Ligand binder design. Structure first.
Ligand SMILES: *[C@@H]1O[C@H](CO)[C@@H](O[C@@H]2O[C@H](CO)[C@@H](O)[C@H](O)[C@H]2NC(C)=O)[C@H](O)[C@H]1NC(C)=O
Lengths: 49, 23
């Protein structure tokens, strides 16, 4: 905004985004799906839910 | 003279547990 050899001035426009939490979860586990093997009319099959 | 190798018994313990629904 101003520039002299002994004096300056500046302006900055900052925008912020604040997330507001509804709930926070701390003690968490990932799932892993191993399923089961089945043998049927000669064919080996992997089964999963 | 006669030299022979007699088998002798031994074991290792193996434990197993289930995984409900495979999860
Ligand atoms: C691992 O498991 C086997 C299970 O058979 C243990 O065997 C025992 O060993 C002792 C000697 O310390 C014998 O007196 C018992 O008769 C054995 N029988 C059983 C069924 O336990 C083996 O010694 C174990 N070793 C380790 C490193 O834990």
């Amino acid at each position: 905004t101003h520039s002299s050899p002994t004096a300056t001035a500046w302006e900055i426009g900052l925008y912020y985004e604040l997330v507001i939490p509804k709930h926070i979860y701390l003690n968490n586990w990932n799932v892993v799906n191993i399923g089961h093997l089945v043998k049927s009319a000669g064919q080996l099959t992997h089964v999963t839910i | 003279s006669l030299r022979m190798q007699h088998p002798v018994p031994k074991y290792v313990e193996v434990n197993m547990t289930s995984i409900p629904q495979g999860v």
